[PDB]
């Protein structure tokens, strides 16, 4: 997973910092987006290998962010979710995955590495 680049889309700075240092200490590179517009910009400009996408974004919603990215590229996604809209959550499998909030940060590492290996 070394050098793999993870786009972390999360508006809570502390939660995003926790995810970031857990991923970096495993040897991955991290790019932070604080909202959906930034996620779309950074996905376009950076060589992203996987997107970790919180459904709870300030203006747009995780699902329509994902739809906008999808019609462009098939980049793997792991959605961070509290579990309504459970239908398209289960649909993520799929080749994608999800992490339920609150999570143990080690689960994020494990699912990122697994999805990357799979894809």
Shortest distance, position 117 Cβ to Mg ion, whole Å: 26
Known binding residue 56? Answer is yes
**Of residues 10 and 97, the one with the C-beta less far from Mg ion:** 10
Kindly list the distances between the CA atom of residue 70 and the CA atoms of 39, 66, 75, 91, in Å, as whole numbers in the listed order: 12, 6, 7, 14
- # residues contacting Mg ion (CB under 5 A): 4
Of the candidate residues 20, 54, 96, 97, the single one contacting Mg ion (CB under 5 A): 54
Of the candidate residues 13, 21, 41, 56, the single one contacting Mg ion (CB under 5 A): 56
**Of residues 82 and 95, the one with the C-beta less far from Mg ion:** 82
Residues found near Mg ion in the complex (CB under 5 A): 10-11, 54, 56
Residue set of the binding site for Mg(2+): 10-11, 54, 56
């Amino acid at each position: 997973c070394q050098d793999k680049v993870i786009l972390v889309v999360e508006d809570d700075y502390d939660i995003g910092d926790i995810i970031e240092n857990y991923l970096k200490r495993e040897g991955m590179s991290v790019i932070r987006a604080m909202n959906g517009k930034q996620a779309i910009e950074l996905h376009a400009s950076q060589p992203i290998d996987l997107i970790l996408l919180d459904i709870k974004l300030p203006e747009l919603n995780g699902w329509e962010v994902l739809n906008k990215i999808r019609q462009k590229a098939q980049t793997p996604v792991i959605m961070l979710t509290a579990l309504d809209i459970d239908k398209v959550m289960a649909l993520r499998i799929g080749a994608d995955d999800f992490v339920v909030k609150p999570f143990n940060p080690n689960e994020v590492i494990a699912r990122v590495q697994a999805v990357l290996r799979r894809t």
